[model samples]
Target: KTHVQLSLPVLQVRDVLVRGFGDSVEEVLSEARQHLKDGTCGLVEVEKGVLPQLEQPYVFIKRSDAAPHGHVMVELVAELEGIQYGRSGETLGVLVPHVGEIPVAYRKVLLRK
Candidate 1:
C-alpha cells in the first residue's frame, strides 16, 4: 500500500502566478464529470481530505508548469498556517480560490474561492 502523510507536510502549494488556466473550472469539470461516474479518478484529482476538514464538493489543483489539460492535483488541508518557504526561495503557499461566474462556493479549493 502507498502512504498518505495525513498532513500538508511542508505545505507544497505553488505560487498562484496566473489567474486561471486549463479551462474555466466549470469547463474542466464538465469535461471530466463523466469520469467520476466511470470509477476512474485522479485525471482531475483532489487534495487532502485531512484532519480539520475541507472548505467544497471537490478540488482540482493547478501546477505552475501545467499546460492545457495538465496533470495537476491538490487537496485543502485546513491549517491556515500561512506559508512555508523552502530553502530554494520556493514558498509553499495556499491556493486562494477564485470563482468564475459559476459561483462554486466550495472550500479553499484552488479553483473556487
Candidate 2:
C-alpha cells in the first residue's frame, strides 16, 4: 500500500518503534518529533513498529536515504480533532526512552493507538 492512508477515529493509536541517536536514550526519544520529515524516507520501504513502551519498546524504524548513512526516522501522529488542542503534557515530565515510563498525562494520548 504505497501512499497508504488510514483515517482513524478520535485518539487513534498505532504501533511504532522510534529510533533516534543510538548514543543515548535521551537523544533517541527526546527528539521524537524531529524523526518524521515531510518527504525524505522510503515510502515503499516504510515498515511498522509497535508502541506503549511497557508492552512494546520500539517504533517502526523507517530508513531515511535522504539522511546521513545509518540515519533512522520515527513517526507520531497527533490528530487535530483532539490531542492537538488538548493538554499534551509537554510541561508534565520527560521521556528517557528505555530508561523509564512516559509521564502519566502523555501516556493517555499514546494509549489510544
Candidate 3:
C-alpha cells in the first residue's frame, strides 16, 4: 500500500472546468506532456468519424498502474495539470485517486496535491 511515483503510459484530456485548456484538445495534452517533462501521453485511436484531432469526450486508455494488472495510474491533464484518477478505459473506466483530485469538491487548493 505504498504508492510513490508520478508516471503513466498515456492519458489525454478529459475535461478542464477551469478553462484555458489551450486552443485545441491536442494543445492541452501537449501542454501536459511538457509539464510532465516527458512524452507520457500517446494517441492510440479515436471515435469513428468523430473529430479524431479533437479532445476526447473521455480520455480512453489502458491501465499502467495495476500489479501487472493493478488499476492504479497517475494521469496528469496537460492544460490544467489535472492530477486525475484512473488509467484505462479497457475496463470501462474506473476512477482511482493518485494524490487527490484537483479542484476538489467545494475546496480550493487545500492540500499538497
Candidate 4:
C-alpha cells in the first residue's frame, strides 16, 4: 500500500478552536498547504474546527526528524467511525487529536486516497 493509490468518498467538517488575529488562520493554513505541496508535511487527518475560514481542519504532519530532541509527534487520523453523535448538545461531531470532539457541519465528497 505504500505506493498504491486509492480513492474514497469522505465527509470533511471544519471547526474553530480559538479566535485569532484577522487572517492569521488563512496565513498559517496557506503555509501549511505549501509545506504539504513541497513534501515538508504529510496529510495525517482532517481535524474538526481548527480553522476559521473553512469548516475542514487540515492536519499537516511535519517531519518528526526535523524537530528538536524531547519532542513527541502524535499521529492523528480522521476515521469515519470516529464520528461522534449527540455529544455536547450537538448532533454531529468528529474526534480530534490533542483537542476533544467538536460539533460541525459537513458534507460528503470523493477524496483521493
Reference-based TM-score of each model: 0.21, 0.19, 0.27, 0.22
Candidate 3 on 1-113: residue-level lDDT in tens?
23333333222224322222244446554444443344222332234443233443233324344332232443433211343333332322211112222322220111012
Judged by lDDT relative to the true structure, which candidate is superior, 1 or 3?
Answer: 3
Per-residue lDDT over 13-85 for candidate 1, one digit per residue giving the tens place of the 0 to 100 score: 2322222222334443443333323422222113453312322222333332222233222332222234222
Q: What is the lDDT of every predicted structure here?
A: 0.26, 0.23, 0.31, 0.27
* Candidate order (TM-score): 3, 4, 1, 2
Candidate 2: which stretches are off by over 4 Å? 1-20, 37-113
Q: What is the lDDT for 37 in model 4?
A: 31
- Evaluate model 2: give its lDDT: 0.23
Off by over 4 Å in 4: 1-23, 46-113
The C-alpha stretches of model 3 lying farther than 4 A from their native spots are 1-4, 7-20, 38-71, 74-87, 90-113
Q: What is the C-alpha RMSD of each candidate to the true structure, in Å?
A: 15.1, 15.5, 11.8, 15.2
lDDT tens per residue, model 4, 2-99: 12111111223332332211233354445443433343322213345323333333332222222223332222222123442112221122222212
Which ten residues in a row are the worst by lDDT in model 4? 1-10
